């Protein structure tokens, strides 16, 4: 059997691997339990994949995942969790930003009773404070959308069991925020603080574009919750709009409105503005109703069983 | 074979388990049926799982669900019942504010022939009359949503039978309004009017944000009534509106109205404003439509068969 | 092997039985092939599951599905289609409304290689001007829906063969319009022409409830054809409100318009009610993409092979 | 075991059976590896089935598959490569347009170790300079959508591979853009130039309809760009309606100065054109991550997999 599974997914990465094997060679050798690393080629353009077979021909822990394309690292960890045995999965990164070593530190924490551990960052440490608020109220955001309050600065470097990699392949979804998602499969969950290594520190161009994609996957494929706070703002705005309209309709008939000689213009727009909106607001309601539906999550998930046996 | 199984949600209820177990083997006992009790432990941060294990340990007809976080009464109502293995299922609180020894009275109902056995409070007794009337527009206005009439007064205190249960369990959909669901599968019905025992008030605060959004979900989660009054009303508007401006362009060609110079902004936000609301009116059909399919409900639902064997 | 399947969906059916059955073996006695009838009990509250039960006990050809509630005349038949085992499916009516005798003619025509053969009417006799008006018009309309020409005045009495009752099974969705469904499945199809006992050539009730939801049945829950005859008109209009409020614009920058100077008003109401109507167009045709993508047809029907096993 | 696939869909292609299939085995032939022709009828009104049954009897090779109606040419490819077991699929038109020589090139790249080997026309040539005009610009705005630019001039002559036909079977989509399908599954693909058969050219006329259904079916049936770049230019739209607005409403406020003493009604018109525009961008964004759910596409696509055995 495996023990613990270690996802790498790669993207452009030789002159890598020699480094990321070895220092992986000298964290996993002293756990003293069978291992195995999941490579997930995720469709480089690079003379990689023919380095992972000469590591996998000589080593017999190394198995390799080949994307028929390049999928995104999120999409490469979830192939290669999907693939990987382990009874614990570590998804690491082939560019050895976060230590593996830590990895010690968090198969510890598993065999404490915990079963998902997160590898938190102390702290940002090399962003340019723009990028630390940025972050600090999106995931207050998030956190307020969410009911386990996912800890600050997680990556994707952590400890799965593999109560919890099953839960989150019984997740049938195909827009997935991550992080939400893991936030939904609540199991004992804990965090351990690491401190990257000072050599990495900001150099990546944090283009705005892609980070407004992450910031929208994250607020509308995980919750409905900016869903409802429209059509209630919504419906607000429209209950507010045929008041003023049937208030002008008085104010008209009873005072004999004609100052302008045409005053049925604003009733007109205020009304049809109002019935449009509660359209939509119905339309908001029962497309978020869908979008559950669609979404097919379980409705509860069972972490133990005293005296039955687990439902297939 | 297991004939009973009594469902209990448990949420933070130690110090209440060994009264609760005293009851339930008080009133089961003399029923000389093989009987089996499921605990649903809703994520408890209290110390309701030791109690519960120990339990189990002594008694045999203990049995541990462990959901992985706080998923809510209802949602371990469903856990517990999906596992539930007995011929008649009956969903009772840990709290004993739904007497035990009604339990008895229900069997003896579903011994009559019944397949659903509801339990009924007879008169609310403690709740005042911004929690009656509420209550009574909510059950009329559910009544007719559905066309089997749920009978009012009811809680999750219930017995349902294995056909029941099955039938239940072959409702896919994520948004569950409970009540409806069970008028739905319209199985032989019945109720059993019982007391609520007076240890309890009914001075309960009533968190109106909840009693709102359970409201909405009922109202919006179970049919498509509220989608089908509107882009009905919606689409009257639209063809007054769009009868309006016809008639007002005439005005303008024949009578020649050019008193105010500009009596055509008008013409232009009736035509618009029904337009749009032909659109949104056909927008919502189909998303009613897509929302019929995507909740996957069986067409039908065979209750007996006589020369026929059920079909997989 | 049963060679023939009579589906019966019966409701308050009672003291209908014993004539009908006595014609349905007086009609099926004679073809000298293995049959069965298969009385689908749509929760009548009479007393015809009692009489349908002992007609079961008497004779070895009866089965009875009972299904739990009242469902609808549409969903028996469904219920009758899946259990009948037959190699020729024909739904008919406890009332004897449709002579039980064309049974013969149908079969012949089934024997003649068509897979589906329907009953038509020779003419509505009863109904004389509008009742034929308003049918014509709407299966003109329901027959530019498909492109395979279901044939005119035909009910629910039919004959299908076993490949079209499989077919058909394999349709899977909710919101279903058989008389569309029938022809999306296209096979060889044909028709006979019964006259209907002067019995049932009287004066009928037809609520504008019952056939107004069937209209919209047939209109929205069979194809995207009213939303893609939307979309366009809807979207005409936003191309020619955009254009005009261009021409405003136009009018307005050069030949500097002081009458009325509020003008420009338009402009606004226009461009704003052109941009909403290509929002919407671009939602309905998604949302059809969407309500066409969870229908989940099948993407092609084979009817024979010739060299290869057909796919599981 | 089949080392070829040769799928004909065929309408009313009497005429061609004998030049086709006389073609097809001096092609073949020389290749000396097992090949299996499947002939898709696609509903036919003609006697095409019948000499498809004759050359079946004649030849061990020809198979068919008969549909049920005409469905189309795309659907009769689907279901003919569904039904090819052949280690690579090659597509082809019964009326002999693309040579079948061709074949014999397409193996060889696809011995060469490519996955889908293209078959693109060398130039559009006899059509007219607009129609070529069009064509390029709809391949460059569908090339941004892809991921891998497919090649240019394409059409549904081509070689799959046996692992490129098992992924294009995992999806399991209804409205289907097969250019953008091949693209997003992207495997080691390739081209081989050919040009067209002489006297072929200049004899079609474009069905505009068609050719509408055809580009809204790539624009909307295939990815979400077009949904989520009008939901963007809506929120600009939106945004600068409510800023002029809150601008207008300033300069009613400030400076005092109200000229007409009706400009409230473009206040009105702006504020509620706004709030709807916001609207119908979040009814956009759900529907677009709700039509992402439905599709149902798979996260990723296994190639080559090392030291793991594929999941099932
Ligand atoms: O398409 C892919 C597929 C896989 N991986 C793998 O993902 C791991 C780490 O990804 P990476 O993007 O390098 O994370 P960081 O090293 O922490 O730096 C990132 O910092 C930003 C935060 O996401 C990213 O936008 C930048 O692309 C990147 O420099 C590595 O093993 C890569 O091989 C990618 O990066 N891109
Ligand atoms: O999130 C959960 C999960 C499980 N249970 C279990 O449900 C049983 C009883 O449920 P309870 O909520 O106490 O029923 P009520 O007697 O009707 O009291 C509640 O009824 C209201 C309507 O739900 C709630 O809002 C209030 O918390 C409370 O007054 C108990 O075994 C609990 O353990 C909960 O109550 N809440
Ligand atoms: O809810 C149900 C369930 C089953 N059946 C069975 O369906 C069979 C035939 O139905 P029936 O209503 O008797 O046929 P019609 O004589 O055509 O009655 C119709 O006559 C009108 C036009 O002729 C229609 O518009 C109405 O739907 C309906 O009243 C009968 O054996 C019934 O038992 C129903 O009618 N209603
Ligand atoms: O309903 C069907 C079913 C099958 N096939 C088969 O599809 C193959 C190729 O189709 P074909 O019509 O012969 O292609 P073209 O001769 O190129 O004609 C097309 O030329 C244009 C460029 O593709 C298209 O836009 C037009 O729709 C169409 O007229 C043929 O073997 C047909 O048998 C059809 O054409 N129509
Ligand atoms: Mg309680
Ligand atoms: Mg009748
Ligand atoms: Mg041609």
Redesign the pocket.
Known sequence: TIELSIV??????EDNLEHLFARLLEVLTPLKITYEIICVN?GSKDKTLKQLIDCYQSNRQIKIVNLSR????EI?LSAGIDYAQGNAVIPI???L?DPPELIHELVDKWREGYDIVYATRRSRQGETWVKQFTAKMFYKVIGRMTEIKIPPNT?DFRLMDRKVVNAIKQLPERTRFMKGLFAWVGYRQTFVLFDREPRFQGQ?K??YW?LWNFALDGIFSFSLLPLKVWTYLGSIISLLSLAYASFLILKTITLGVDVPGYASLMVAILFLGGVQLISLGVIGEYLGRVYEEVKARPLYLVSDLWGLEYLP
Do not use: L, R, S, V
Request: a negative charge.
């Open positions: 790498i997914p790669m993207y452009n990465e995720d390049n999928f995104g690292k490469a990164d082939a560019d930003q990556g990546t944090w283009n892609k």
